[PDB]
Structure formats: C-alpha cells, structure tokens
Design a binder for this molecule. Structure first.
Ligand SMILES: CCCCCCCCCCCCCCCCCC(=O)OC[C@H](COP(=O)(O)OCCN)OC(=O)CCCCCCCCCCCCCCCCC
Ligand SMILES: CCCCCCCCCCCCCCCCCC(=O)OC[C@H](COP(=O)(O)OCCN)OC(=O)CCCCCCCCCCCCCCCCC
Ligand SMILES: CCCCCCCCCCCCCCCCCC(=O)OC[C@H](COP(=O)(O)OCCN)OC(=O)CCCCCCCCCCCCCCCCC
Ligand SMILES: CCCCCCCCCCCCCCCCCC(=O)OC[C@H](COP(=O)(O)OCCN)OC(=O)CCCCCCCCCCCCCCCCC
Ligand SMILES: CCCCCCCCCCCCCCCCCC(=O)OC[C@H](COP(=O)(O)OCCN)OC(=O)CCCCCCCCCCCCCCCCC
Ligand SMILES: CCCCCCCCCCCC(=O)OC[C@H](COP(=O)(O)OCC[N+](C)(C)C)OC(=O)CCCCCCCCCCC
Ligand SMILES: CCCCCCCCCCCC(=O)OC[C@H](COP(=O)(O)OCC[N+](C)(C)C)OC(=O)CCCCCCCCCCC
Ligand SMILES: CCCCCCCCCCCC(=O)OC[C@H](COP(=O)(O)OCC[N+](C)(C)C)OC(=O)CCCCCCCCCCC
Lengths: 77, 90, 74, 53, 64, 132, 61, 69, 65, 80
C-alpha cells in the first residue's frame, strides 16, 4: 500500500548474496576439509562412542559397594 | 464398572487366533502397569518414612529403601513385543 | 469419565489387595472408608484418612501376576 | 539561583535530621563494637574459652 | 535524597550491625538440629576449627 | 591499535558482488552523524558479505591488547598459582592434623548410617571409635 | 475503563471454569461419581469394541 | 516535556508516564479485588496445607519397614 | 499461610503488568510493594513456626508429570 | 562444671531425641538439654548460656582425648 519500508539497495544486495551463496561455492581443498570434518570425522567420533557404550551402561538404581571414607588416619610424621 | 484384566499367556495360545493374541498382549501390558502402581506405593512409604524419621531415615527406612532400589530396574513398562516375538526357552 | 491405564492399575492393585487378604479385619476397614476419589491419593496428603495398613500389606505382598503369564524361562 | 565567581565552597550546612541520624547510626555501631569487645575479646583471640569464667 | 530512599537503608543498616549476633546460634551453634542440611560424621570439623587454631590465625585477617 | 576479529577473510569472489575492505562498525567514531546513528551506518552504504560479524549486534571486540599477549598473561596468572600450589604440596609444608580425626561409638555409627549387619559395617560406618 | 472488553474476558473464563468445576463436583456426589458431561454419551467398553476387532481381523485374514 | 505518541500507543503498562484521570476510582477497585484474593489464598492455603512429619506415627513406620524386609 | 507467602508477589506482578495503565504510576508501585509486604509478614510468621516450633508446611496443588 | 566426658547415651535415647548423626558421640547426653533449652529460648544468645558452655567444654575434652590418640599412634608408627 504505502511502502512503509524504505528499501535499501545495499541491504538488498547483501540479502541476495546470502540467499545465493550456493552459486559461487567451489569444492576446493578448503571446502573438502570442512566437508570431511562435519560429515565424516565428527559422525565417526559419535559413531564410535555410540556403539562402544551401547548396552554397557546399567545405571538404573546402581548400587554402591565400596566404602567412600578412610577408616584409619596415617600421619605424615 | 472396574473391568479386570483377561489373564492370558502367549505360551498357551495360537497367534493365528487374533482375539487370543489380542488378549495376551493386553494382559501382559496390564500386569506391567500394576508393577508401576506398586512401585509408586512403595515409594510413598519411603517418602513418608524419610520425613518422620529425620536423622533416623537411614535406620528406620533401610528395608524400604533397599526394596525400592531392587524393584526400580524392572518395575516399569516393558511392552509385549519383546516376549511375544521371543521364546526364552530357546 | 476417563480411566487411564495407570489409574486403572491403582484400583486393580487395591482390589487384588482385598481379594488376597479377605481374612484381615483391619485391611477391610480402611478400604471401605477409602473413597473412590481418594483411592488414587494413597500416601502423605492433606486428606485425613487411614491407609497405613493398606500400604503395609502392599509392601509385604507382590500382587502382580507377571510371572504367571511368562510360563517359559531360560 | 546565581553563580558567584571565585568563591570557595564553605562547610556544607545539611539538614539537621541527616547529621543527627548519621551520628546515631555510627554511635550504635561503635557502641556495639565496644560492647562485644568488653565481653568477647578473650574468646575472639583464643586467649580464653567461653565456659572459663 | 528523600526519606523514602533513606528508609530501607536505615533498616538494612541496623540489620547489618545486630543481625549476625542474634542468628549465630541458629546456624552456627554446635548440635543445632538442621537435618535439611546433611553433614556426614566424618566431615564435622567445627571442633578442630574452633579449638585447635593458633591464636595468631584468629586475628591475622584483622591485622592484614 | 584496532585489529579485525578472527575468521574475517582477506579476500572473496562472490561473482559481481562489490569487494570492499572489511570494516568493524563497532570501531567507528560515535561523534559523527549517521542516517542510522545506533548502528553507525549511512543509508545505501555497502555491506561486507560477513557484515553480521562486523556490526553492533556482533559480539563486542576487545582490542586493547593482542589475543596472544592476552592469553600469555592469562596463562601466566594461573601459572603462578600452579607453581605456588605444587611447591607447598611437594615440599609438604602444610600443617599436620593436630589430633586424630573424630571417632564415633557403636561401631562408628554403622547401624545409624544405613548398615544392616556386620557384613556391611565397613561399607557405611564412619571412623570407628576403637577406644570404646 | 478498567472493565473494558479485554480485562473482563480473562476473569469470565476463571469464574465459568470454577463454577462448572464445583457443579461437576456436586454432580458426582449424587450420581455415584458420574460427571456433568454424562448427558453427551458413555465410553464404549471392551466387549463391544473387541467384536469389531474380531470381525476386522477376520476380513483382513 | 516531550512527545510520546500516546494517541495510539497504549501498552498494558502505561506508555511513558501514564496515569488516567479516573486513577483514584480504579485504584479502589483494584485494592478491593487484590484484598479479595489474598483472603481467598489464605483460606485455600490453610485448608490444603499439612504437616508431612505428622501424617504417620513412628509405630506405623516400624511396621512398614518390617513388612518391607 | 504458605499459599499467601508464595503467590502474593505474583499478584502484584499481574496487577502492575496488566492493570498498571488503568491505575497510574504511583498506585502501581505501592500495590506491588503491598503484595511483597504481605509475603514478608507471612514469611516471618512461618519462620517462627518452622525454625522454633519444628513444624513443616506442605501444599500440593495438583500433579504435573 | 564439666570435668570429664559424661556417660555415653544408649542407641534408643539418641533415636528418641533425634540427635544429628555427626553429633552422636560422648557429648550426646549433654546435647539433649541444650537443644531442648534452645527451642524454648528461640536460640537466643542469652537463654542457654550455661547449657551451651557445658556442651562446649565437653567437646573440648573430646578434642583433647583425640590428641592423645594421635600422639599414642604417632609412637607406634615410629617404634615399628
Ligand atoms: C556419488 C558420486 C560422487 C561424485 C562426486 C562429484 C563431486 C563433484 O561434483 O566434483 C566437482 C566438479 C565441479 O567442479 P568444481 O565445483 O569447481 O570443483 C573443482 C575444484 N577444483 O564436478 C565435476 O568435475 C563434474 C563431474 C561430475 C560427475 C558426476 C557423475 C555422477 C554419476 C553418478 C551419479 C550418482
Ligand atoms: C559453547 C561455546 C559457545 C557456543 C554458542 C554459539 C556461539 C555464540 C552464539 C550466541 C549468540 C551471540 C550473540 O548473540 O551476540 C553476542 C552477545 C553480545 O553480548 P556482549 O558482546 O557480551 O555485549 C556486552 C556489552 N557490555 O554475547 C552474548 O550474549 C553471548 C553470551 C555467552 C553465550 C554463552 C555460551 C556458553 C558460554 C560458556 C562457554 C565458555 C566457558 C568458559
Ligand atoms: C486466565 C484464566 C483462565 C482460567 C482457566 C483455568 C481455571 C482453573 C480451573 C479451576 C478449578 C477449580 C479449582 O481451583 O479447584 C478447587 C481447588 C480446591 O479444591 P481441592 O481439590 O481440595 O484442592 C486442594 C489441593 N491440595 O482449588 C485449588 O486447589 C486452587 C489452588 C491454587 C494454588 C494457589 C493459586 C496459584 C495461582 C495464584 C494466582 C491465582 C489466584 C488469583 C486469581 C485471580 C487471578 C487469576
Ligand atoms: C495466556 C493464555 C491463557 C493461559 C493462562 C492460564 C493458564 C492456566 C493453566 C491451567 C491448566 C489447567 C490445570 C487445572 C485443570 C484441573 C486439573 C485437574 O484435573 O484436577 C486435578 C486435581 C486433583 O485431581 P483429581 O482428584 O483427579 O480431580 C479431578 C476431578 N475431575 O484437582 C485440583 O486440585 C484442581 C486444582 C486447580 C488449580 C487451579 C490452577 C492454579 C494455577 C496453576 C497451578 C500450577 C502450579 C503453579 C504454577 C506457577 C509456577 C510455580
Ligand atoms: C533485647 C531483648 C532482651 C535481651 C535479654 C536481656 C539480657 O539480659 O541481655 C541483654 C542483651 C546483651 O546481653 P549480653 O551482654 O550479650 O550477655 C548477657 C548479659 N546479661 O542485650 C542484647 O542482646 C542486645 C539486643 C539487640 C540490640
Ligand atoms: C497469569 C497469566 C495471565 C495472562 C494475561 C493475558 C490474558 C490471556 C488472554 O488474553 O487470554 C484470552 C482467552 C481467550 O480470548 P478470546 O476468547 O479471543 O477473548 C479475547 C478477545 N476479546 C476480548 C476481543 C473477546 O481468555 C482466557 O482466559 C482463556 C482461558 C483458557 C481456556 C482454555 C481453552 C481450551 C483450549 C484447549 C485445551 C486442551
Ligand atoms: C510467570 C510469568 C508471568 C508474566 C506476567 C507479568 C506481567 C506481564 C506484563 C506485560 C506488559 C509489559 O510490560 O510489556 C509491554 C511493555 C510496554 O512498555 P511500557 O513499560 O508500558 O512503556 C511503553 C514504552 N515503549 C512503547 C517504548 C515500550 O514493554 C514492552 O513492550 C517490552 C517488550 C517485551 C515485553 C515482555 C513481556 C513479558 C514476557 C514474559 C515471558 C514469560
Ligand atoms: C487483582 C487481580 C490480580 C490478577 C490480575 C489478572 C489480570 C489478567 C490480565 C487482564 C488484562 C489482559 O488480558 O490484557 C490483554 C493484553 C493487553 O492488550 P489487548 O487486550 O490485546 O489490547 C491491545 C489491543 N487493542 C489495541 C486492539 C485494544 O493483551 C496482550 O497482548 C496479552 C498477551 C499475553 C501476555 C501474558 C502471557 C503470559 C504467558 C505465561 C502465563 C503463565
């Protein structure tokens, strides 16, 4: 109606660039390193941890069977 | 009125009978919810014992606390698919 | 008038308490005067009611029949 | 209000309520500090035990 | 400033002089029942703190 | 003096997008007059591709000292406290306990501490008063 | 205006909900625990529902 | 003093030093309503509160522990 | 006594938050101060009843989970 | 006028008086009147002056008794 927003050319170019960053992406060595870390290295770390302790954590009502405090005090003298 | 569980075991039915299988699934589920109800009642005893005992809760509620920790790992809903689809004897 | 499965299981536990200890005079007295609206409020609460023996019998007896449905063991 | 050039600030004359209240509050603290010292200076420094009298 | 601003400060000022002395026995008294806070018997050092301390350490923070 | 925050690229080629030197708008002079005084920006002024890391809404950047120098001091401060702590431990200069730690009767209050019988006495009891 | 269209509405819901709640509380004492909404209908029971299940599983088989 | 645009900006909390002409009338209507809620809270609190350390005798706790064994 | 101590400050927040426009700046501030003071007095009564008389108060509104 | 450690309380007497677990020691008997007077005195610094002092001096004897145990143990370790 009244165009309540004062459109800014620099903002529009900045907005358009952010929405179209895929156009200029290149699968260079820098990109490959970041892709490997987020999609392979990090999932592998969780992948190992998830199955390493899968079914090996019976924490429901786990009981204490070892005394906490020391009975006799041995002086340093 | 209070409808009661139709006690039926997976070991005494034919799974081809869909009604008998349906009762066995329901009967196992209803028994598991009774255990949870029993666990909550036993926990209520522990809560009441702890408050009134004060510094004597270790001694006054020793057997109650031991009972709660033993029942806790298994007094929960486990479903029926595990026992329906598995034969422990084999 | 919706009875959830947990609400049904609480009533069933008290019903099985009666059906297994019909010879206990003290148990029947507390159950009869334990109203339906107060059935699910067992334990410490604002309501003045006698349920100590009700809790005591449950603490001593396993009223679930889960082992009966599992007729096969390892 | 008028500003007087080259006039040093004299001693302020605050409302009497503020001055009296401030001294009394300090007087309460100092009296209480001395009152506890008169009765607890041995125990404070470990020179004596509270039951010893 | 005005009296309304002053009034809470005076009330706090008096509580900053006498409050700790009156409430010391409730929380710091030996054997006072405070079962809400649990202290294991092996962790009660209120005796070795009160008696075994050298007299110098009792005043060292004051001197510094 | 001032320096750019980390992870701000020196170069970029996003097609025909204008290439301007990355500027932290937080460091601009506030006594100047701008169309957007709060953000210290004039109308239609071009934005860096990562301008969100170089504006007022970005985390405040500290430029009094370099990060390497700031981290050298931070490690030095805790390094002093680490050596001070280790020397007293290895040297063993901390005072000895003046008395035997507190003992308690009834097998070290075993029953009062959740023990059931003599098998679990040492599992729950405190230091046992051996002198009755 | 302190009793405008926007201020009154939240208080009306509270009064209506509490009044109906007490009405339902009184309605259960004289009707053996049955609620106020018993006029709309009744909950269907297992015996009739399982008949539909038995016929449903028969056609599927 | 300044301009606050109060003709349309009417937040629930006032909008730049707002006090209606009939503020005395509404204040009394609020104080009575506020007083009618503290009393209602007090009656609900007294009738609903209980002492958790007195709902069961120590003899009853002994029977609970022995049965739980 | 317990309910009055806890939820009275909430009443002051609601009154100033949504009725502060209709009562003005001055009355809004003092009504909030009034609500906190009611909690102050109720707390002191409970402090004597709990610390000195070894009494506890418990109110259970309803089940959450 | 406490001069020696008083007699040890029984198990039930500690239970009935609800003595704190960390304070269930030789001075338990003297602790019962102190905690009983503190309740009636609202834990004021001017209501249980002597009962508090008697309990304070008892713990002093218990502390000195544990000094003897450490010194006695300190000789067995060196002798062995
Ligand atoms: C699953 C198959 C995985 C194939 C990986 C292809 C990765 C790729 O697209 O290579 C990039 C290249 C485009 O060139 P560019 O983005 O500039 O990267 C060059 C960096 N110096 O792309 C190319 O060089 C073109 C070759 C693309 C071959 C695609 C064949 C797909 C056939 C199997 C589909 C499944
Ligand atoms: C884990 C590492 C953090 C990962 C979280 C994601 C990265 C940060 C994202 C938060 C969004 C940042 C933001 O909104 O702007 C920064 C904001 C500005 O606030 P500030 O710069 O402090 O202005 C102070 C003026 N006096 O500053 C903030 O409001 C951020 C507040 C801190 C965020 C907490 C994150 C965890 C902090 C603990 C980790 C460090 C432990 C040492
Ligand atoms: C926006 C408003 C929308 C309102 C929709 C929600 C309405 C809530 C339904 C009300 C149902 C009626 C009711 O309150 O139940 C009655 C009950 C007393 O009966 P009883 O079962 O014995 O409770 C004892 C619990 N141990 O009464 C109670 O137990 C209520 C106890 C409440 C606990 C104190 C109040 C907490 C909230 C404080 C602010 C509310 C009070 C001010 C009311 C005006 C402002 C809302
Ligand atoms: C902005 C958008 C608008 C939203 C703002 C308003 C949101 C209100 C949210 C309310 C949600 C509904 C909760 C009340 C519904 C009634 C609950 C109920 O079914 O009753 C449970 C309880 C006892 O259960 P029972 O014996 O089964 O009684 C059933 C009888 N038919 O019976 C009772 O004791 C009834 C108790 C009624 C309590 C009244 C509500 C008090 C305020 C909420 C209390 C929650 C705790 C305080 C939370 C504040 C943060 C600490
Ligand atoms: C005040 C209530 C009355 C206090 C009891 C009266 C009393 O005998 O003690 C006065 C008391 C300070 O007494 P205090 O020197 O600490 O030791 C007891 C010596 N009579 O006085 C006080 O404790 C001071 C009260 C706070 C100021
Ligand atoms: C303490 C917090 C206080 C909040 C302050 C703001 C007031 C809230 C407000 O505005 O809620 C507004 C609502 C309804 O609004 P409406 O019907 O559109 O009327 C407002 C528009 N008028 C004035 C033009 C007519 O009213 C209530 O109370 C609703 C209470 C909740 C009832 C539950 C509905 C069932 C949903 C499904 C459940 C499973
Ligand atoms: C348990 C939760 C209970 C919450 C109930 C408390 C009372 C609510 C009061 C609402 C009215 C108010 O204050 O918001 C509106 C006021 C109005 O501004 P003003 O001060 O009248 O001046 C006006 C001058 N302006 C116009 C320049 C502001 O501010 C605001 O626009 C602040 C924006 C964010 C509001 C956040 C509301 C609270 C969020 C709560 C998250 C759970
Ligand atoms: C003594 C009694 C003490 C208790 C008092 C209770 C007061 C209740 C409120 C009455 C006033 C009212 O509902 O206000 C409603 C308000 C006021 O704006 P509006 O009505 O839309 O007018 C503006 C529109 N116009 C211009 C067309 C007229 O709306 C809101 O934006 C309310 C948004 C919800 C805020 C709170 C969210 C809380 C979430 C978490 C809850 C725990």
């Amino acid at each position: 109606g009244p165009h309540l927003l004062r459109e800014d050319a620099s903002f529009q170019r900045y907005g358009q660039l952010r929405d179209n960053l895929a156009t200029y992406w290149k699968f260079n060595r820098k990109a490959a390193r970041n892709v490997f870390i987020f999609l392979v290295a990090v999932p592998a770390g969780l992948g190992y941890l998830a199955y390493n302790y899968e079914g090996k954590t019976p924490f429901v009502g786990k009981r204490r069977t070892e005394p906490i405090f020391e009975q006799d005090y041995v002086p340093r003298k | 009125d209070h409808v009661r569980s139709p006690n039926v075991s997976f070991d005494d039915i034919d799974y081809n009978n869909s009604q008998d299988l349906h009762n066995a699934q329901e009967s196992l589920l209803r028994e598991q919810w009774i255990r949870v109800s029993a666990l909550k009642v036993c926990r209520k005893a522990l809560e009441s014992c702890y408050k009134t005992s004060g510094p004597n809760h270790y001694e006054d509620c020793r057997e109650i606390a031991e009972k709660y920790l033993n029942m806790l790992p298994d007094h929960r809903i486990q479903g029926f698919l595990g026992y329906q689809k598995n034969d422990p004897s084999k | 008038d919706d009875k959830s499965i947990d609400e049904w299981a609480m009533d069933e536990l008290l019903l099985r308490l009666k059906e297994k200890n019909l010879s206990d005079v003290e148990l029947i007295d507390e159950l009869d005067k334990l109203s339906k609206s107060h059935v699910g409020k067992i334990g410490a609460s604002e309501i003045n009611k006698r349920d100590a023996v009700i809790i005591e019998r449950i603490l001593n007896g396993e009223y679930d029949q889960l082992s009966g449905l599992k007729k096969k063991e390892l | 209000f008028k500003y007087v050039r080259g006039a040093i600030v004299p001693k302020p004359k605050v409302h009497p309520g503020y001055v009296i209240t401030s001294k009394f509050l300090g007087g309460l603290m100092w009296f209480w500090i001395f009152y506890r010292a008169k009765q607890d200076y041995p125990v404070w420094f470990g020179l004596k035990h509270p039951w010893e009298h | 400033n005005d009296i309304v601003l002053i009034t809470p400060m005076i009330i706090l000022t008096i509580l900053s002089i006498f409050g700790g002395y009156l409430l010391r026995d409730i929380y710091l008294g030996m054997g006072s029942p405070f079962n809400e806070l649990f202290i294991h018997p092996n962790n009660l050092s209120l005796i070795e703190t009160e008696f075994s301390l050298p007299s110098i350490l009792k005043v060292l923070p004051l001197i510094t | 003096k001032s320096f750019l925050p980390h992870f701000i690229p020196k170069n970029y080629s996003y097609g025909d997008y204008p290439r301007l030197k990355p500027e932290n708008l937080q460091k601009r002079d506030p006594y100047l007059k701008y169309d957007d005084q709060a953000n210290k920006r004039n109308f239609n002024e071009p934005l860096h591709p990562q301008q969100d890391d170089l504006d007022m809404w970005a985390p405040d950047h500290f430029d009094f000292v370099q990060d390497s120098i700031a981290l050298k001091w931070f490690g030095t401060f805790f390094g002093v406290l680490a050596v001070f702590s280790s020397v007293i431990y290895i040297g063993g200069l901390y005072p000895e306990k003046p008395a035997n730690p507190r003992n308690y009767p009834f097998s070290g209050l075993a029953k009062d501490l959740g023990a059931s019988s003599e098998e679990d006495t040492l599992l729950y009891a405190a230091k046992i008063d051996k002198s009755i | 205006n302190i009793f405008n269209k926007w201020n009154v509405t939240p208080f009306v819901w509270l009064f209506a909900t509490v009044g109906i709640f007490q009405w339902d509380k009184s309605h259960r004492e004289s009707h053996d625990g049955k609620g106020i909404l018993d006029f709309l209908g009744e909950i269907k029971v297992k015996e009739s529902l399982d008949t539909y299940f038995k016929e449903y599983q028969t056609k599927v088989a | 003093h300044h301009i606050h645009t109060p003709s349309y900006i009417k937040p629930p909390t006032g909008g730049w030093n707002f006090t209606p002409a009939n503020w005395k009338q509404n204040t009394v209507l609020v104080l009575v309503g506020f007083t009618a809620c503290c009393v209602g809270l007090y009656k609900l609190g007294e009738a609903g509160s209980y002492n958790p350390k007195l709902k069961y005798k120590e003899e009853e706790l002994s029977r609970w522990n022995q049965s739980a064994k | 006594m317990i309910l009055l101590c806890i939820f009275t400050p909430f009443l002051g927040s609601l009154i100033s938050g949504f009725f502060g426009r209709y009562i003005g700046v001055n009355s809004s501030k003092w009504i909030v101060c009034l609500s906190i003071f009611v909690s102050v007095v109720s707390t002191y009564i409970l402090f004597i009843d709990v610390i000195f008389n070894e009494i506890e108060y418990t109110y259970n509104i309803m089940n959450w989970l | 006028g406490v001069s020696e450690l008083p007699e040890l309380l029984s198990h039930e007497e500690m239970k009935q008086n609800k003595i704190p677990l960390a304070y269930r020691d030789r001075c338990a008997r003297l602790l019962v009147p102190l905690n009983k007077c503190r309740k009636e005195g609202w834990y004021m610094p001017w209501n249980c002056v002597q009962e508090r002092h008697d309990y304070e001096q008892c713990q002093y004897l218990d502390f000195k008794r544990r000094v003897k145990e450490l010194e006695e143990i300190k000789k067995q370790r060196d002798a062995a």
